Amino acid sequence: TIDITLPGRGQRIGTVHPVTQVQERICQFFTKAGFTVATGPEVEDDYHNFEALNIPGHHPARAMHDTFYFDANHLLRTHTSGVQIRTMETSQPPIRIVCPGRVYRCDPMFHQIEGLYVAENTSFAELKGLLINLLNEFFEKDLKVRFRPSYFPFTEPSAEVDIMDERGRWLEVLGCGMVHPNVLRAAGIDPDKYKGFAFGLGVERFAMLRYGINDLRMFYQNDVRFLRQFA
Amino acid sequence: MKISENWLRTWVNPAIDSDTLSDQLTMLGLEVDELASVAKPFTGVVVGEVLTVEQHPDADRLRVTTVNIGSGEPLQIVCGAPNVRAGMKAPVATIGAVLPGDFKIKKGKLRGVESQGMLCGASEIDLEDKIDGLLELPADAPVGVNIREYLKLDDNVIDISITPNRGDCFSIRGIAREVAVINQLQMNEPEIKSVDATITDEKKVVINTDGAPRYLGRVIKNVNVKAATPEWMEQALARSGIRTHSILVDVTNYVLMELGQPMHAFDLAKIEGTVHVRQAKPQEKLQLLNDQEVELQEDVMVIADDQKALAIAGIMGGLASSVTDDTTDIFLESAFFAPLAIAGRARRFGLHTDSSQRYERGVDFELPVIAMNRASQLIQELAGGEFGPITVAEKSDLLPKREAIELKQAQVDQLLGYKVAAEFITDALTRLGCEVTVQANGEWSVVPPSHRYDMAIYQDLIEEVARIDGYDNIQISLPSMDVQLAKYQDRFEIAQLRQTVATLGYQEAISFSFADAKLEKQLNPQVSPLMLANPISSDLAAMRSTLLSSLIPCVQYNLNRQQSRVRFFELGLRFDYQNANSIQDLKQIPTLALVAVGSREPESWHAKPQPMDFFDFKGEVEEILAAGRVKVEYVRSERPWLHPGQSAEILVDGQSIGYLGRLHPSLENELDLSTTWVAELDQAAVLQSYVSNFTELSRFPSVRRDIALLISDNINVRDIQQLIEKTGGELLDSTWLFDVYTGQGVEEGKRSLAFALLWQHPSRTLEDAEIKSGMDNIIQVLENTYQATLRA
Amino acid sequence: SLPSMDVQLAKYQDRFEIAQLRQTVATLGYQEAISFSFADAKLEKQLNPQVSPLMLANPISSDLAAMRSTLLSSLIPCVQYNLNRQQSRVRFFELGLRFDYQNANSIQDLKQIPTLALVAVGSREPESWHAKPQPMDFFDFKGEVEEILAAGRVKVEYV
Numbered sequence A: 001t002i003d004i005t006l007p008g009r010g011q012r013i014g015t016v017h018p019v020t021q022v023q024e025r026i027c028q029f030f031t032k033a034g035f036t037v038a039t040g041p042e043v044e045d046d047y048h049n050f051e052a053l054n055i056p057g058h059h060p061a062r063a064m065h066d067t068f069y070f071d072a073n074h075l076l077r078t079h080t081s082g083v084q085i086r087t088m089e090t091s092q093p094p095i096r097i098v099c100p101g102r103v104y105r106c107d108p109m110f111h112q113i114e115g116l117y118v119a120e121n122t123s124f125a126e127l128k129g130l131l132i133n134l135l136n137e138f139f140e141k142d143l144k145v146r147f148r149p150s151y152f153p154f155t156e157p158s159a160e161v162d163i164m165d166e167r168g169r170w171l172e173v174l175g176c177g178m179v180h181p182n183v184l185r186a187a188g189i190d191p192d193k194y195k196g197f198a199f200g201l202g203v204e205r206f207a208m209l210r211y212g213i214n215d216l217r218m219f220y221q222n223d224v225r226f227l228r229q230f231a
Numbered sequence B: 001m002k003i004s005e006n007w008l009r010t011w012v013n014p015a016i017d018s019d020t021l022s023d024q025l026t027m028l029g030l031e032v033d034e035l036a037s038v039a040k041p042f043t044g045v046v047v048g049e050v051l052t053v054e055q056h057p058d059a060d061r062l063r064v065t066t067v068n069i070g071s072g073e074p075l076q077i078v079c080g081a082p083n084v085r086a087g088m089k090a091p092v093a094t095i096g097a098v099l100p101g102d103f104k105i106k107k108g109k110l111r112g113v114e115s116q117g118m119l120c121g122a123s124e125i126d127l128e129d130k131i132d133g134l135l136e137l138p139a140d141a142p143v144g145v146n147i148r149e150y151l152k153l154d155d156n157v158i159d160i161s162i163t164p165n166r167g168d169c170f171s172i173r174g175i176a177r178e179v180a181v182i183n184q185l186q187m188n189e190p191e192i193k194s195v196d197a198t199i200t201d202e203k204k205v206v207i208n209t210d211g212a213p214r215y216l217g218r219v220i221k222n223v224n225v226k227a228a229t230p231e232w233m234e235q236a237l238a239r240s241g242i243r244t245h246s247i248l249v250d251v252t253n254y255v256l257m258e259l260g261q262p263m264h265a266f267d268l269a270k271i272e273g274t275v276h277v278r279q280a281k282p283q284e285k286l287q288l289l290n291d292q293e294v295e296l297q298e299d300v301m302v303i304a305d306d307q308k309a310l311a312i313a314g315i316m317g318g319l320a321s322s323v324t325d326d327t328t329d330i331f332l333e334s335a336f337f338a339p340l341a342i343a344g345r346a347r348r349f350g351l352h353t354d355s356s357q358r359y360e361r362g363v364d365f366e367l368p369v370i371a372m373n374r375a376s377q378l379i380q381e382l383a384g385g386e387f388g389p390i391t392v393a394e395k396s397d398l399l400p401k402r403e404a405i406e407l408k409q410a411q412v413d414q415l416l417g418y419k420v421a422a423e424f425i426t427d428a429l430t431r432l433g434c435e436v437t438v439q440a441n442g443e444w445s446v447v448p449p450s451h452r453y454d455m456a457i458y459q460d461l462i463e464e465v466a467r468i469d470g471y472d473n474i475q476i477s478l479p480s481m482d483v484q485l486a487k488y489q490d491r492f493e494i495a496q497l498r499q500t501v502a503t504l505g506y507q508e509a510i511s512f513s514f515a516d517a518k519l520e521k522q523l524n525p526q527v528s529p530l531m532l533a534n535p536i537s538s539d540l541a542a543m544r545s546t547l548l549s550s551l552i553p554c555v556q557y558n559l560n561r562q563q564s565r566v567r568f569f570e571l572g573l574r575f576d577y578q579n580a581n582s583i584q585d586l587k588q589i590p591t592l593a594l595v596a597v598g599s600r601e602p603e604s605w606h607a608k609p610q611p612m613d614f615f616d617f618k619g620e621v622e623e624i625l626a627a628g629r630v631k632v633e634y635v636r637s638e639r640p641w642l643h644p645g646q647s648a649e650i651l652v653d654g655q656s657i658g659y660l661g662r663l664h665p666s667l668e669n670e671l672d673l674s675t676t677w678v679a680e681l682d683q684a685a686v687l688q689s690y691v692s693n694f695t696e697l698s699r700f701p702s703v704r705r706d707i708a709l710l711i712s713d714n715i716n717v718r719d720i721q722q723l724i725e726k727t728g729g730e731l732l733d734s735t736w737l738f739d740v741y742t743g744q745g746v747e748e749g750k751r752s753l754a755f756a757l758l759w760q761h762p763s764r765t766l767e768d769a770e771i772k773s774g775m776d777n778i779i780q781v782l783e784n785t786y787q788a789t790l791r792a
Numbered sequence C: 001s002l003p004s005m006d007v008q009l010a011k012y013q014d015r016f017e018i019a020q021l022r023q024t025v026a027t028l029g030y031q032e033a034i035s036f037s038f039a040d041a042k043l044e045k046q047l048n049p050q051v052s053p054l055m056l057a058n059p060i061s062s063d064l065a066a067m068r069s070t071l072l073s074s075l076i077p078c079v080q081y082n083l084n085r086q087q088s089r090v091r092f093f094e095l096g097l098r099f100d101y102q103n104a105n106s107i108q109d110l111k112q113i114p115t116l117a118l119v120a121v122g123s124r125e126p127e128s129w130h131a132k133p134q135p136m137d138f139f140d141f142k143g144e145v146e147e148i149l150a151a152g153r154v155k156v157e158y159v
């Protein structure tokens, strides 16, 4: 007979990153509800990242400063739009996808999930409802959400959603909108026979509000004590 | 139910091959299990007439004969058939014949006598004869036609399996109506002729029950019970799976297969006074027509008289009223019995007759009057007798009601999903037997026929439309729903549990939920397992109180087949039934079982294979628990089937969620299991939800300190660790044991433990004063609580 | 309001899922790391001195200028980060992208392939009373990689 309370001889369980946990939590809402996860390359060209999103070229929606680039027509992703573009150009509606993945900007690496839904008919009313219960069931609260009008060249009408986090403050969590007709028409989808909406949320924004983190630099310093807190 | 196709052709001849006919029945809801010819195929066998017979050749007991099969110069053939009259006409296989089994008789010579075929085949033709040598009974002579056409041996028997909702199809008339509806034909039923009454004999009406709303009885005097059963009626019953008996039983079995109305004939001389259709007396005795004597109940309807009982109503007749070879006058019964008054009662006594299953299901209540005329016509034609009047005992108000059902085009379009023509809906229903009246403009008022018991709501009529129109005409669509994101909390999913246990080297087993009660008693001698009432075997009779009672036989299965190492895990329902006063107190807990025998890792060149110890098994259970963020304290388990010194109880918040440890070594020898490691965990405890909370990390270096205690071996290291963490305060953030020693230098009964103390500061850098103050505080309380000696 | 859709069972072939890979590697004792897709060119040349690194035109710093040809160029700094903070044992695994720009004559010849990396420093098991802490050998590490390949029904040969 031996002392039964001595620690066992084995291996300590590993750790899943909190950014990937939040990413899996947001995607599973759409995964088991009809949407399919889609991924693509992180080094993109100019057409699939700008010209195909109803951006003429030298439009003010370029901002060549805060976008990492190599040549003049090859850059790092500012958003996972290329996967949504290629899905529309090859496949035909109905389209129900969510596009996670890391993107880059000069400030530098962060993840964001961008869903896309194109069917025979949708509306601004359905976009607001799907986003509301997405925010309600993610944070597991009865949130007070605010829809503000904003601008995106690929959406009209376009909106930005906030939640009353912290102490009565309004914090932006995701942008959305109804897919612009030129974005559907440029990919081979008749904007008169098919409607569509889209959205985009920063994963690091959701992860910090969900786990109470205040310095997102810890997400990529990868301190083993920090990662262990999510195990 | 097996029926002859040619008998079905006499009612409906669709002029299509047998394959498409069976395809129509299967696609109509009547799954044909088999369609085969009456006899196995064979080529070349005509009919001949035997002329002369000579005996005593080649000693023994043979006879050479000559048969005229229409040939100009017929040849001979020897045979040893013991018959009566010589010179019979019998089908004969030719020389180039191909009897079943490659029995091509190559003529030759039977010791000199030249042969040309075989003029026999009592069993070689697939006929079921009693006495040998009865090849083709001399009933008549088809004058040399092929044997496949005289007895209709190329006919097909259709083995139809019909569902209980279609009780009308348990007869030739019910199947022919189905074949006539699908092919838009009209069934030409055989013209039935009623028998006129010449005598005026007795009668009896009895309304002592509600399960016989229509009874018809006919007294027929001076019948020939020993009459000859014709070949057409014998074969029609034979290839329908019904045996031959007397002439009266064959007729009642014939009308049962033809129309679907069961009948029964009694021995009028053995009926005393009036006949009664009543409920049996409590525990009333009766000897059926078979040697079985049954004891009835007061809910089984029977047909009795003024003293005794004659038969069970619509199930089986009795021996006291059976028509024997001394029977002269008979009483023919033709009644409709309510299906609710016959269902189940036949299975009580192990009985399932053709009259039983048809009365339990729906039988045409407008048919008793028709089957009475059918039997009386066949009885007079085939046996003859003095026929009396028809006794009608009818309670017309309690017949199965068939009120009108309303059906609209919108209901048929909604349920089917596609539009069927209103001309199709009316035509299909009206030929199935319904009287549909076009109410209003687009709706219908359809009444169900008297023979169908499955039409009550409008959906029943919609099923009939899809049946006749064809299930291959169902248009393809997809259901629609709203995209709603369901509530979900972060948890340890069952799939991620399997991936962890499989990564730890365990194979998922799935054993039976019931196991042997003796093995269940071996594990826990104080167990009260839930026992099945009708288990298929003794080793599968007790619902497993633990998954070991079913996994151990699977381990022994592999161990007995040259398997040194077998590791299982199952998910995993056990049945807690102890300390329960009723079966509603049963607890069905989904659990995670672990069974491991043999070495930890497979045999390799790194080390010699040795079985695990307790800490190898605990290290695997600790990781399964850690994979679900489960905080656990361990304590000694007291389960009977466990080694009391190496078995833990897994507690969370003080309550147990499972155990881990090796089997009791005595049980290992009784089961021949070497050394086994078992564990069980509640899934609700392992597959639990979790929530992560972020805490700040210090930006300044920590301090590492060592303490070496010499303490008695009878104090658990958890209590030592818990005491150090409490007295250490908030500065001490973590501690862990890293060395034990029980060798030379320590007295017996004590051990030297070495703990590691990690001191952390949230804001500043630790000074040597506050650390030594905590170190001295921890060593002092350890010397006071346990009387130990410390070092650094 | 809510969007409506036709429920149609999508095509799916049985495979080793990404969520099942994370569980297997985590059971082997590895923590998931997410390092920057761009790393320092000096470390990129320290690992492979004959590397042709894809370098940025406007890098945010000198240590974040070259897209990683291997996940090690971005995981090694994180391993050193913990070591510079009293961490004897650190076991990482990352499921990101590496950028193969070797023998490429233009930018469209870039191959962005997703990779699974493993970095291990320290003892195989945490410090306990069972054994003195000792680092892994080749067969401790091969036994872990073999199980990852075995978890996906991958038949391999070693050279």
Ligand SMILES: C1=C(CCNCc2ccccc2)CCCC1
Pocket: A053, A079, A080, A081, A084, A085, A114, A115, A116, A152, A154, A155, A175, A176, A177, A179, A180, A183, A197, A198, A199, A200
């Ligand atoms: C949308 C896109 C652009 C990618 N970003 C998603 C987003 C949408 C609305 C607001 C913010 C972010 C790809 C083609 C189809 C329509």
Ligand SMILES: [Mg+2]
Pocket: B165, B454, B460, B463
């Ligand atoms: Mg029906």
